[PDB]
Write a protein that binds this ligand. Structure first.
Ligand SMILES: Nc1ncnc2c1ncn2[C@@H]1O[C@H](C[C@@H](N)CC[C@H](N)C(=O)O)[C@@H](O)[C@H]1O
Ligand SMILES: [Cl-]
Length: 260
């Protein structure tokens, strides 16, 4: 019947504005973005700043061995490009190709000169659901829009996963795919099938806010899908009770500067 994550989602939808604001960041990990946010507002491109919070999330996965990027990196839904810029600093990465929709309401690629910027091409105006898949060594995808409806989250995740499949058939050796909604019975069954075909596992990145159940399907992970999902649901539900817990900070990403 009802999964733990579905219980989490229903309770999230019952929170007041104050409860939601306090719960959102209770006990999460975070980078302080004040220094980067000013620079990028001033139009600076050489301070080594990440363009987005996304860089810290991919760094977390890469630094803990869940993903080893190499060769040709594709970044689907690159937005401003936080994942692409981080990938460009990795020694074995040869090229980074990012694709994002852009337009009103959506994020545009940011052009900065952090280390390895010269091996990057960020392309806006691309709907990846209509782009032909091509071969690559590392496949990245950070697509999926949050919704108050778990029904919507499931459907958006399935669309992403069907699109990702065509790229995985080009047989990349590494991948990191956002799974917005892993917590429904259909989604757990879907990811068991995908795990059987392509390997990998699901990982909860602790920089994710408590207001999303997003997990990342990464090639270096092996965990049982149901256990990893249910563990994350338990964590998120427990944080809804008791007092607010402090945010834990890591230092923001410094990607350096220069060319490769
Ligand atoms: N069908 C789509 N095609 C291309 N881009 C999309 C599509 N749907 C959503 N997006 C974009 O994917 C991006 C998702 C971002 N959260 C990714 C953040 C990125 N990883 C970073 O570090 O900056 C958003 O900018 C979306 O506008
Ligand atoms: Cl998105």
């Amino acid at each position: 019947g009802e999964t733990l994550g579905e219980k989490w989602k229903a309770r999230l939808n019952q929170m007041s504005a104050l409860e939601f604001y306090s719960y959102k960041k209770s006990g999460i990990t975070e980078v302080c973005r004040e220094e980067a946010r000013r620079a990028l507002k001033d139009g600076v491109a050489t301070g080594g700043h990440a363009v987005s919070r996304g860089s810290a999330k991919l760094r977390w996965l890469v630094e803990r061995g869940y993903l080893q990027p190499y060769g040709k990196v594709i970044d689907l839904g690159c937005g401003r490009g936080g994942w692409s810029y981080y990938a460009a600093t990795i020694r074995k990465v040869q090229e980074v190709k990012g694709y994002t929709k852009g337009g009103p309401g959506h994020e545009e690629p940011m052009l900065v000169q952090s280390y390895g910027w010269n091996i990057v091409r960020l392309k806006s105006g691309v709907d990846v659901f209509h782009m032909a898949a091509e071969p690559c060594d590392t496949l990245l995808c950070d697509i999926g829009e949050s919704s108050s409806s778990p029904e919507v989250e499931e459907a958006r995740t399935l669309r992403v996963l069907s699109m990702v499949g065509d790229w995985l058939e080009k047989r990349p050796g590494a991948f990191c795919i956002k799974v917005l909604c892993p917590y429904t019975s259909t989604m757990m069954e879907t990811l068991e099938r995908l795990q059987r075909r392509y390997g990998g596992g699901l990982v909860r990145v602790p920089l994710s806010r408590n207001s999303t159940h997003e997990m990342y399907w990464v090639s270096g992970a092996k965990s049982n899908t149901i256990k990893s999902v249910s563990t994350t649901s338990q964590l998120l539900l427990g944080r809804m009770d008791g007092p607010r817990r402090p945010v834990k900070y890591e230092e923001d990403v410094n990607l350096g500067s220069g060319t490769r």
